[PDB]
């Protein structure tokens, strides 16, 4: 469409342009006569007059392009629009902090929240084309700011109405700040767009200021998003969030946007994990359906935001697929789950307003069961496609739980709960570890043979690899419990041998993750032949670890060879710069740094005693310390508050402290080779050289601290109050199962057999033991504050405050795991239709139990007055959990 107003504005440009041709028309024909006659006195007078009519039209036409100013006048009106709305935010902040502004009783909160949500959604849809249309078209710049600046003037008017009738005073002021943050981000976006003007001649330093303003607006996206829908999820309002399913649907109806930069196998792995997360989330809401319907508010809103992540991940899936028939088969299955979840949220939102209603609960049961069968179809087509390491995603999630199964077992011996079970000895179970290892090398050998081929032999070798280690980890627990609790240190080196093998096995499948049916000339597929060769040296160390325990002359000699072998696997990727996802405090690194001073007293005195059992007690203490220290040297380094110049100083000091300790680990090998005391005196001299790197690691940790304080709170104070606070919480969790009546109602009871009575007596025996276990833990720390073993000095408070923070956590994580098991036992009697949930709830309640027993035994003994009550009741927890574990294998299968 053409506008006559800009047509009249562009019309003087054609005036000087057409008269330029008029000055050029008479010029050449007068120059045509000059070709015949070179010397004519009136000809040079009119030829200069011809060129003057050109040049007078030159100066007017050139300055008209600079006096055009496209998009310059319209952005100035957006400045006054932003200056007006900011002054609206000024006086609203004055009135609401004084509570003097009268609200509007006619208008509603959730009606205003629906308007403000839709306002930002139309804003956010314009921002991503705005950055591209900035540099491309200068007339589009004034065009888009006419659309954008007109949005904020009723949006601020909609904001001041909801904030006036907002009851919560911290919530009534936080909405003004993010709108102020949204306004200034668009104001700096106005500053970057006006200064650049969409000029490709202008340099890229303005373009980096544009992309900074892109992330400034993207910051204003998620701040305004999460603050308002969660406020709507505080009520039972289903509006906008149900439209967000449609707003995820219409982008799928747009079709393939373009060719993706990532691989088809990369986005397939991101889909199957997010599809696994939403299936257990709605199954969690089955438990919260009849029990606590008020908790269902932000649960579906979390599922609302995750479905937008699901649609965005599935957006380049069709183009990345080889067949459009398979790719279009995926995209409709997303909307099938989108239709079912949309009925799931709006029925629960009315159930949020009506908690006493039970028919909507039963109506929510079937549509949750419908999408459970529908989510089986969104992965069966992925199973039909040979592309995608779908078995490897199920492999890595399984062996992480096997690692979590081994996490319970490494804390069995350190707490001392792993007693000798019957007549089991090391000679009885040494071959079952190795006979499984004989098939393990053959499973490792065919992994590089299945590097190129079909998906059927690849997924069969992937599933048999998980079946190998699960057969291996069960006989590891048979061999670890066979040694007895009297010598716990050889139990630790037995499990940690196969634990680092499993960590090497988890990295082994990650080589086949990027290599699915592909060639082997790539170095990552050569790393599939190299990390397996590392695993070959680990599975033969597993042959040697069996040979280490069975004798005593080379007991700690052969155990330390596998200890130094494991550190070089860790130090290879530690020297490689890898930003971790987890953020660790530097105070946790200070606890691990000061622990080497106590570890040097254990390491040198073991070599001076020349006892191979004390070397294993050193090698278990050295490997456990050096593993998390290099993790704390990597996770705390990439914290945003930590300065980026001081983190490589700690990475340099952390590398050479491990290099100074590995040489110390090489010299205590010579102490096992040579019993001369002259080699023992060098261990005292080498201990300060590691401690010299420890003191530099301390001073590197001193200059990295982004927090204002070296410790958040006092360590002994909050550890004591949360101890007795969680002591009554388990007793409150113990009476919950007795409060739960048997499900006489046929509607809520999915399963009503007699094994629910076996679960309930197992859950009550969990609840009765943990009520006495936490009182054994209540007398444990009360003896720690009476005898005074953990210390109270402020210098060691950084070494004990992280333990005191963990003493709060592991008591509350026990209080959380006993809450989630009671949440599982609430779902067990009514029927949860999930076998793996009751397995995971009974395993984590034993995992937190050994975690708190480890957190209690730090700077404490195993045979205290309360620790022996922690031992007897802690064994009563595990024997009740494992009875519940085997009952959970048959529960809802």
């Amino acid at each position: 469409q053409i506008s006559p107003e800009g047509r009249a504005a562009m019309e003087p440009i054609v005036i000087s342009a057409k008269t330029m041709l008029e000055s050029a028309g008479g010029l050449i024909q007068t120059a045509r006569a000059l070709a015949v006659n070179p010397r004519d006195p009136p000809s040079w007078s009119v030829l200069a007059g011809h060129s003057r009519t050109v040049s007078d039209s030159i100066k007017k036409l050139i300055t008209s392009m600079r006096d055009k100013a496209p998009g310059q006048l319209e952005c100035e009106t957006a400045i006054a629009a932003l200056n007006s709305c900011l002054r609206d935010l000024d006086q609203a902040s004055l009135a609401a902090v004084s509570q003097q502004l009268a609200p509007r009783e006619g208008i509603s909160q959730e009606a205003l929240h629906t308007q403000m949500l839709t306002a930002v959604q139309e804003i956010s849809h314009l921002i991503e084309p705005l950055a591209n249309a900035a540099r491309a078209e200068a007339s589009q710049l004034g065009h888009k700011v006419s659309q954008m600046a007109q949005y904020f003037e009723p949006l601020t008017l909609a904001a001041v109405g909801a904030a006036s009738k907002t009851l919560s005073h911290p919530q009534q002021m936080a909405l003004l700040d993010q709108t102020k943050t949204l306004a200034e981000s668009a104001l700096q976006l106005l500053y970057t767009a006006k200064e650049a003007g969409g000029n490709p001649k202008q340099a890229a330093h303005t373009q980096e200021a544009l992309e900074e303003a892109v992330q400034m607006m993207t910051e204003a996206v998620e701040d305004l998003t999460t603050t308002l829908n969660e406020a709507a999820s505080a009520a039972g309002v289903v509006g906008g969030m149900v439209d967000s399913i449609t707003q995820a649907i219409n982008q799928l109806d747009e079709g393939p946007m373009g060719e993706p930069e990532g691989s088809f196998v990369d986005y397939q792995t991101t889909m199957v994990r997010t599809a696994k997360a939403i299936a257990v989330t709605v199954q969690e809401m089955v438990t919260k359906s009849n029990t606590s319907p008020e908790e269902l508010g932000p649960l579906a809103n979390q599922l609302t935001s995750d479905y937008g992540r699901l649609a965005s991940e599935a957006k380049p899936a069709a183009v990345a697929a080889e067949n459009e028939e398979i790719g279009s088969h995926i995209k409709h299955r997303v909307q099938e789950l989108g239709h079912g979840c949309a009925a799931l949220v709006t029925k629960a939102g009315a159930l949020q307003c009506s908690p006493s209603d039970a028919y909507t609960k039963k109506e929510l049961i079937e549509c949750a069961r419908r999408v459970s069968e529908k989510v089986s179809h969104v992965l069966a087509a992925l199973q039909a496609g040979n592309r995608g390491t779908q078995a490897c995603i199920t492999a890595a999630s399984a062996v992480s739980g096997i690692i979590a199964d081994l996490d319970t077992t490494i804390m069995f011996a350190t707490a001392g709960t792993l007693n000798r079970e019957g007549t089991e000895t090391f000679a009885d179970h040494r071959e079952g570890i190795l006979k499984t290892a004989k098939v393990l090398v053959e499973d490792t050998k065919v992994l590089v043979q299945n590097a190129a081929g079909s998906q059927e032999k690849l997924a069969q070798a992937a599933q048999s690899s998980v079946a190998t280690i699960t057969r291996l980890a069960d006989v590891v627990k048979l061999g670890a419990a066979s040694l007895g609790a009297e010598d716990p240190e050889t139990q630790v080196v037995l499990i940690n041998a196969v634990k680092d093998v499993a960590k090497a096995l988890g990295d082994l499948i990650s080589a086949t993750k990027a290599a699915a049916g592909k060639v082997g000339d790539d170095p990552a597929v050569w790393q599939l032949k190299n990390s397996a060769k590392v695993m070959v040296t680990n599975v033969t160390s597993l042959l040697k670890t069996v040979k280490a325990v069975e004798d005593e002359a080379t007991k700690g000699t052969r155990a330390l060879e596998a200890t130094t072998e494991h550190i070089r696997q860790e130090l290879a990727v530690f020297c490689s710069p890898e930003p971790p996802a987890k953020t660790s405090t530097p105070e946790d690194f200070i606890r691990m740094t000061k622990g080497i001073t106590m570890a040097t007293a254990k390491a040198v005195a073991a070599g001076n005693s020349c006892r191979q059992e004390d070397v294993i007690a050193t090698a278990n203490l050295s490997r456990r310390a050096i593993a998390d220290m290099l993790r704390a040297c990597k996770e705390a380094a990439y914290h945003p508050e930590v300065a980026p110049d001081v983190r490589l100083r700690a990475l340099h000091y952390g590398r050479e402290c491990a290099n100074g300790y590995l040489e110390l680990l090489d010299h205590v090998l010579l102490t096992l080779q040579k019993p001369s005391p002259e080699l023992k005196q060098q261990l005292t001299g080498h201990s300060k050289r590691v401690a010299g790197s420890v003191t530099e690691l301390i001073q590197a940790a001193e200059a990295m601290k982004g927090t204002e304080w070296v410790d958040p709170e006092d360590p002994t104070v909050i550890a004591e109050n949360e101890l007795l606070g969680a002591a009554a919480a388990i007793e409150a969790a113990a009476k919950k199962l007795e409060q739960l009546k048997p499900r006489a109602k046929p509607k809520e009871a999915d399963e009503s057999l007699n094994f629910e009575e076996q679960i309930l007596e197992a859950a009550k025996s969990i609840a009765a033991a943990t009520s006495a276990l936490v009182k054994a833990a209540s007398a444990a720390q009360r003896e720690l504050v009476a005898q005074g073993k953990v210390g109270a000095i402020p210098a060691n408070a950084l070494d004990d405050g992280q333990w005191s923070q963990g003493l709060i956590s592991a008591a509350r994580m026990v209080a959380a795991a006993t809450n989630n098991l009671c949440e599982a036992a609430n779902a067990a009697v009514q029927g949860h239709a999930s076998q793996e949930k009751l397995i995971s709830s009974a395993k984590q309640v034993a995992a937190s139990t050994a975690q708190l027993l480890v957190a209690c035994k730090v700077k404490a003994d195993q045979d205290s007055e309360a620790m022996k009550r922690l031992q007897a009741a802690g064994n009563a927890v595990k024997r009740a959990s494992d009875n519940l574990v085997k009952a959970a294998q048959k529960a809802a299968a």
Binding site: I13, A17, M20, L21, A24, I28, A31, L34, A35, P38, L47, S51, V54, S55, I58, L61, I62, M65
Partner: protein, 48 residues
């Protein structure tokens, strides 16, 4: 694109005139064909 032909046709105001002062007819005639082509890109830019 305007600033290209502004210096070309600005020189061609003196380029086609000085050759006619000397009578350099092949030099003047080639200067017209370059100035005409410069006006072709001038008009096609100004119309855009």
């Amino acid at each position: 694109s305007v600033m290209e032909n502004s210096k070309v046709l600005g020189e061609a105001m003196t380029g086609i005139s000085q050759n006619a002062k000397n009578g350099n007819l092949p030099e003047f005639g080639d200067a017209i064909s370059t100035a005409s082509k410069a006006l072709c890109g001038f008009t096609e830019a100004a119309a855009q």
